[model samples]
Target: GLTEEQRMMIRELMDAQMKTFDTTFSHFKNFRLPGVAKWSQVRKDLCSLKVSLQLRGEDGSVWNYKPPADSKEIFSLLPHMADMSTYMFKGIISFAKVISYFRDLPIEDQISLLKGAAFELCQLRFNTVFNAETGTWECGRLSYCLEDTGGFQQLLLEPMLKFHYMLKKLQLHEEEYVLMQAISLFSPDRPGVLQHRVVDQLQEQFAITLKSYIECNRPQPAHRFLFLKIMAMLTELRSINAQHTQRLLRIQDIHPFATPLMQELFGITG
Candidate 1:
């Protein structure tokens, strides 16, 4: 029978080796796919087993609440949160790439793409906010289409009313309501269904949101700058696709020796 220290050491080593092999095999599979140039790039840039080892050491400072005494114990006590943090960091990097890409497009094309993306995002947000998830928006026992109909109307109406009421409530001399109304007029439920005229509707909505933001700010710049901010956000988002492609390409270029060491530590062959 192994001693406690020996068992723990073996477990830690096995964990590391398994992770290494899994990552390496996954990388190879990705590399073999068609149009996998990006994967190659990602391998080169990110396939560092040494980096993972370092991360296993450094990632649990707050969670462990103790200094790392040795690599074996530190790696053995890896916290799952580190994985989540890495995932989020990657997501942000992805978003940055998307934004950078859209920023390079012609303004007209940018606006068009934004409209489509916004509509999709808005629909997704709406579902998340309502639909038994967030109680703020509800459909009661209504049919799907009816629920959507009422929900969509409220989506347009509430924003308009809030924008309208705020100007009076705050004693501001801005036509915020009118601008919001113009936006509501372009809602998907309206006569022309903004989806078909997305480019035109987005431009109009941009103007409306911009004016409302300016109106709210008064003497200084408009504080409620939704359209401009969303435009910038979308532009940022567009860059991420390209960045992902670039990262994947780098991954594909990594040498096989850089493969994850997980399998060898556990005596598993792949």
Candidate 2:
């Protein structure tokens, strides 16, 4: 039973909180993931580093190989095979560092929270590049299909793509996307976290910011369930994250392809 003036005052406060997020997330929006492409297309000086990245097609063609334009059949470019985990890991750190709340947390707590949320955040960020109509991830000057990951794709891509499509369907504003990212990042329940109380408090505010955003910006009747819908997607993201962790663990035991930074972030021992 708040007065109209009081409600307006509350809204003014909410506007300031959202603006803080807007600035931080604007940086995230501009930050693009590193591109993956064929070795032949890479610079000559960087050839040595890319030799292992040359994944050939069944026909012995590099990832960027193209068919004759006159052919009636459509040709899909295979995703470039490379370990972009380090690059992704670095990018995530940069994102967290920009938020003053994250910077103030104890280093130990920060590390634990990061490890718990890294994969989920990666999925959320990558979804920005997903093209629902094209069924491809548009990264930089290259494009990638789920089929590119081969066996790994089957295990992870199916659910991951579905989740991406769901988020796309929400048609979320840039603000909503970043708010969700913050909510996911500040989760207090991440295993191994010690300062759950503080983390939970931080998460609570972000969640409030998101709900306020929806209630104020979106007209009702049609958008009543939008906040709940977005929260459900976060649950879906966790399942995908668990599956990803299992796969990475299995890979680590058999063959060590993950970079040191990746191992540290995911808690995988060398």
Candidate 3:
């Protein structure tokens, strides 16, 4: 195990990478697939790019090579829809925006928006995974298929939908506000989950010990891109930690999750 300071740095790094990933995913969601035929190409290209960047050896790999601080290429790679101007044009319709908009809208509208966003996010995630260019799973060549649809439906989707329903019940201040609250409540080692008695009260509570829940909920390619983008912002924070440093950490650790899919395509997990 690393020292506390080292751990903190690693955490910081991971956070930074996740931020980038989330932002990129949001952008990908905003766009539509050109067509079904193109989907395969898109998936293939993305997978190739993902592997080229993430799977190479850390010593001299593209994954280890940091882009210039001012590089536009990095930003371009992110989902373009999450751009601030895009939000402004779209009228702030996002998970964050939904909270503020929730209180003001009729309850019906709130339900519609929340459910719509969740469903949309889910669909986008699915599409990203099915994408031939970027998906982690690609039929025989890319073997990241969900082994158990029953498990996904019961263990993952159902609980996530329930969580969305619960959010609708709250008197949220804003979409972002409520989301932040929920994130805090469910966060690792937080007191909120216990104080709120969610473990006992919620029909589908996520215990930290459930390794399948944690490992199986791997983000789609677009989500992964967004996650990395978010991590980039932390570089500007004053008191960075190990988590942030780990953002740059090698993708070697992610192999366990990706292994079952495609042994040759091991590059995707990195």
Candidate 4:
């Protein structure tokens, strides 16, 4: 049987492996805007638009925007959000590909797992960069606030921010975050997944490893109930993910330029 110290070493390895696939967020200027044609149409149509972006006309240049200091309507930011989602999606896929359990799954089951857990992993990844003090997600050169999502539309943004604060307040170590993500990625209950038994066992091992880490490293009071607290956070993440799906579909109704990947991931129609 492996000791707690052995488990911690494994988690450290996972964290280091995970970072190899993590996106190196660059300045917003380097990001490719989704739906450039639609961007041109919006510009042509909304000549009096109040919101502005920092755009440079170069090959593949589009609306490169950072979060506005003052809140703008959701319409103004959704395009950039759409673009960011693409990168986030790619990073998660790359992260999952290296996990042996994930690789061994049937392709369809793998897709199911990724689809169901993508948003959860994204929330986890974002927490690393979130500033609870400022209520900002400092992603490379782009900084986002609740105002960027137009002040928590559809009851979506507040819960996400609150969850980030709770997670950040924990001040989790790097290995803990990686273990949490591993457990999240191997969820067996997602709809359309087969081989639930194998997947569940893998998730169980990851969960045990995380719990062992808490018991070994956390101080007296802090260690107590820490595992439960993190579990509760994962539950909250599921609720937020559902809300996010609804909000994204609604945004597509008006925004109408969601990337093909975003549309496919969220089951967005048209």
Candidate 5:
């Protein structure tokens, strides 16, 4: 039940909220040297790095991150995905805070949108861990280690790697990652939404911001194609969720306690 003015307010809120991770991207830049296998390994370190972030909520509490020993390995760290749960947990909380004014909306509307966007945003959070040049998770020429760990299963892992391969080729900037994640979160047509039009407006706000930013920095005609290309990539993003779920179930079976939210949203069992 957001008025036009109210919706604009939410957009302004996110303008600052997203920049919270701007510095982390500097780490991505640091990882990029005239490099080889080191490219992917740098990301693996990030995934496994220990750090903490402070965000606002209804109180003074801080959000902390204590990554598992191998947080950098992507699917290779399957059983330990549980350790990175803070991002998903805190991301929704932060975004919810972004539009806290909308608390009056039906509780169902909130849950619907969050479930639709959570995994995708979580993927963006680890976007650095994906090696664009290597087409592998977080490993490189050293990628032999991935196969060594048997991380790339056929049905579950292969599809996602293929997807990440395509996404990486886009050579997207960290800002683009933030924009795409915001756009996905505000999407209109995801299942269970009661107010699709409002969500559409929200997504459009982020899209316009992304377009303006791209045009300013990348005025080449190819930039236009790149915009369309990335949007198309989002469609393929959905399948990864299924693959993620399938593999998560595999982990859950191997370590049944792995998926705490297993039975909620999209479950692992068909």
Candidate 6:
């Protein structure tokens, strides 16, 4: 449904974001296994980074500035959240400009689409770095986990783990990852999108491209409908979004942070 120049735009945008994902997370490049790491070491590694972030907690307290005297409750989860924020927000920065075309829309529509797309993009970012086989997010063998792990409970980790488990089974390719992201971003289904036809055409183009790629890449007849299967993953992703947005609202109710940006981008108050 795209013209030649529009098609060219897709390729350029995808390439630029892929590069951003690569460079922002280049810590993966040197990955070597160091299993069962100490909380202290993980904290140091995350904290030492320039973009390290602080996280609020159960008592409406915070961390990443000073270590608490008794650290057990929050320590296990804080570093992970900090690291997550590092990657997720960085992902947003790389993605925001490329999707800036929607900026001229009215404020409410812009807000609605921004949060909707960001949640999807955040899921995409999370899985991109995920290692499906071992089933943990890895950095040189130091891994991030989702094991009920309190203080981080409000993150809706269980649905996310389920989502990841299902997604891993697909064994998707990098191009497929890019194409799925394009489909999710240009959904045209977000609230207040009046002229969704523009988005519909773009989404259709990406779907077609992904199907063609899957056909060529997986000549086996069993793999023919792989694109369709992957499309279902978006449903699971939104299941994640629905669940997490609810959880996030709960957290905001209890340990409220100034999350105007986070709320708008994550489509909070769903």
Tell me the TM-score of each prediction against the true structure: 0.24, 0.68, 0.18, 0.76, 0.59, 0.66
Give the poorly placed runs of model 3, Cα more than 4 Å off: 1-101, 104-270
In terms of lDDT, the best-performing candidate is 4
Comparison by lDDT, 2 against 4, better one? 4
Give residue 9's error in model 2 in angstroms: 16
As a whole number from 0 to 100, the lDDT of residue 183 in candidate 5 is 80
The local lDDT score (0 to 100) that residue 71 gets in candidate 1 is: 23
Off by over 4 Å in 2: 1-82, 148-157
- Candidates 2 and 4 compared by TM-score, better number: 4
Instruction: State the lDDT of candidate 5 residue by residue for 1-270, as single tens digits.
Output: 444653465465556356444323332211111111543544433342222222222355543222234432333443333534433445544655455433545677777777677777666655556655433334211121123223334313455555666676677776677677778777677789898888787778777767766666676665667877777777677666655655545544444444445346453443
lDDT of each: 0.31, 0.62, 0.28, 0.70, 0.54, 0.58
- State the TM-score for model 3: 0.18
lDDT of 3 by residue, 75-193 (tens): 23233212322332232233324332234444443333332233223222223234332223322221232222243234233322223323323322222222232232222222222
Q: TM-score for model 4?
A: 0.76
Local accuracy of candidate 6 as per-residue lDDT tens digits, 1-270: 545755565576577576667533544332221223344443433222122223334366644332233233333333345345545655665665455444445555555555667777777766766666544564322345433233333333456666766676677876677777767767788867765776677678778877776766787776767887898888778777776666555544444432445655554453
Residues 31-115, model 4: lDDT tens digits: 5443435444443333222223444344655444543332224355566666777788877887788766678899998889998
Candidates sorted on TM-score, descending: 4, 2, 6, 5, 1, 3
Top candidate on TM-score is: 4
| Inter-residue clash pairs, candidate 6 | 31-140, 32-140, 115-265
Off by over 4 Å in 1: 1-40, 44-203, 221-233, 245-270
lDDT of 3: 0.28
Model 1, 185-226: lDDT tens digits are 223332223244553554454454445455445554454454
- Give the distance in Å from residue 64's predicted Cα in candidate 2 to where it truly belongs: 2.3
Pairs with backbone N, CA or C atoms under 3 Å apart (clashes), candidate 4: none
Clashes of each: 46, 0, 58, 0, 2, 3
Ten consecutive residues with minimal summed lDDT in candidate 3? 202-211
lDDT of 2 by residue, 1-270 (tens): 444643443454334334432221223222222243232222211211111122333465555522222121111111122144455556677677666678889988889888988787777766777677756666544445533333433423467667877788788876677777778888899888888999999888777777877888898576889999999999889888887677556544544456667878878665
Tell me the lDDT of candidate 5: 0.54
